[PDB]
Each structure stands twice: as C-alpha cells, then as structure tokens.
Amino acid sequence: EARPIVVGPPPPLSGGLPGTENSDQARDGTLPYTKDRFYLQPLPPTEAAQRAKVSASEILNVKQFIDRKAWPSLQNDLRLRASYLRYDLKTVISAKPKDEKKSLQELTSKLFSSIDNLDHAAKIKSPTEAEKYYGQTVSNINEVLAKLG
C-alpha cells in the first residue's frame, strides 16, 4: 500500500511510526489534496482554489530558509512558489465577475509586494528583516486564503 510502513521490524519507541497508541496516528508521509483527479478530470477554476491554498502554504514554509541562511537561493526559490500561486489565483478569480473579484486581486498583489520585501531582506543578508517580512507574508497568505474558502 502507499502507506508509511516497513516489512521489517518497526522502529522502537512510540510515535514517528503509524500506530494506534493515541487517538491520533500523527503520521502520513504525504498529504495529496486531490492526487489523481488532475488526470481523470480537467482542472476547473473552482478546484484551482484547492491548488492555490497548497501553493500558498509553501510561502509559510519560508521560515526554513532563514534557518539555513540561504540568501542566494531564496531570490529564486520563493519566486517559484509565488509563480505557481499566481497561475492558480489567476484562474480562480476568472470564475466570478471581474468587479467584485478585484478585491481578491488587490490582496494577490499586496501579497507579492511582501514577497519582494522578503527577497530583498534575504539578499541584504538580514535575518531580522526576513522574519519581519515573513510575518507580513504569513498575514497576506491568510487573508487570501480566507477568500479561497
């Protein structure tokens, strides 16, 4: 099965492996939102919202660049996540009249301005400013995510 399990003996101690030690298994290995639906059905703009909130969550993972102090990498890497998100959002907003949905696109724009600030903070080698703009990107992601509810 596609489950995190081994045919050999399990590792010792509780947790870190699947089990029923607690009410929660605390283990999955991967979390595919729609998995194979993309190859069975076309991608409508409604389900583009599902893809969008996943690619948005990658921007919440940017804190891990600060730890690794990956200054020359983030300037490319964050923009890759941003591009994926941009494409999906561009699709979601097309499912509604352009006027009301403008409100979402203004958040979509504000969010990317805070990405540019984090990219500059990375290039200027400042972890403090990287965390400062990380807080802003997290807020902007959350606000856009509520509009994808």
Contacts of 8 (CB under 8 A, 6+ apart): none
Residue type present at position 41 = Q
| Side chain identity at residue 36, one-letter code | D
Domains of the chain: which residue ranges? 42-149
Q: Which two tokens stand for residue 23?
A: 């009410």
DSSP H helices, the chain, are 37-40, 48-60, 63-68, 71-92, 98-123, 127-146
Pull the structure tokens for residue 16. 């870190």
CA distance 10 to 7: 8
CA–CA distance, 119 with 111 (Å, rounded to integer): 13
Among 78, 73, 82, 64, CA closest to 144: 82
Pick from 56, 59, 112, 58: nearest CA to 85: 56
Whole-number Cα distances in Å, 41 to 36, 44, 47, 95, 125: 9, 9, 11, 18, 45
- CATH class belonging to 42-149: mainly alpha
CB 134 within 8 A of CB 98: no
